[PDB]
Structure 1
C-alpha cells in the first residue's frame, strides 16, 4: 500500500518521507530509496476474522513454538473483534 509524495518520493509504511525543501533527499540522487512495498498493516487487514464458538480463544500465531507466546483473548464484546496483540489475527465469537 505504498503511495508517493508530490516530490516523487515513496512514503514508507511508517509514514517517513522527506520534505521538498529537505536537503537529505540528495542521498537518493542517482541512487534509490529502498522501501518495502509489503505493508504489514494492509496484509493483516486482508485476513478474515476467525469465527469461533468459544468465549475465550488462544492464539500462538501458528506453528506452535515457531509463533509467538500463547495468549488468551476474551470475546465478550460483540461490538469489537478480539485481536491478538502479537500477530494481529482477530477473532469473533460466532454467537
Structure 2
C-alpha cells in the first residue's frame, strides 16, 4: 500500500510522512527513505476465509510450535467472520 505524498515522499505502513514544511526531510537528500513495500494489512486481506463445520475453531498460526499460542475462536455470530487475534486468519461456520 505504498503511496506518495504530494511532496513525493513515500508514506509508510504506519502512515508516517514528513509534511510540507518539515525540515527533517533534509536527512533524505542525497540518500533515501527506508520503506518496507509489503504492507501486512494488505497481505492478510488476501487470505481466503476458511470454512469450518463447528461453532468453535482453534488457530496456532501454522507450523505447530513455530506458530503462535493456540487460541480458540467462537463462530456463533453469522454477520462476521471469526478472526485470529494473533495472525489475522479468518474463519466462518458452514
Q: State the distance in 2 between where 1:31 and 1:54 align.
A: 54
Runs of at least 5 residues in structure 1 that lack an aligned partner in the other structure: none
Q: State the SS of the aligned residue for 1:86.
A: coil
Query: Segments of 4+ in structure 1 off by > 6 A?
Result: none
CA shift at 1:35, angstroms? 0.3
Shift of 1:84: 0.1
CA distance in 2, matches of 1:9, 1:78: 42
Query: What's the CA shift for 1:17?
Result: 0.3
**TM norm structure 2:** 0.99
Q: Aligned partners of 2:91, 2:31: CA distance in 1, in Å? A: 44
SS in 1 for 2:42: helix
Q: Point out where structure 2 has 5 or more consecutive residues left out of the alignment.
A: none
Distance apart, 1:26 and its partner CA: 0.2
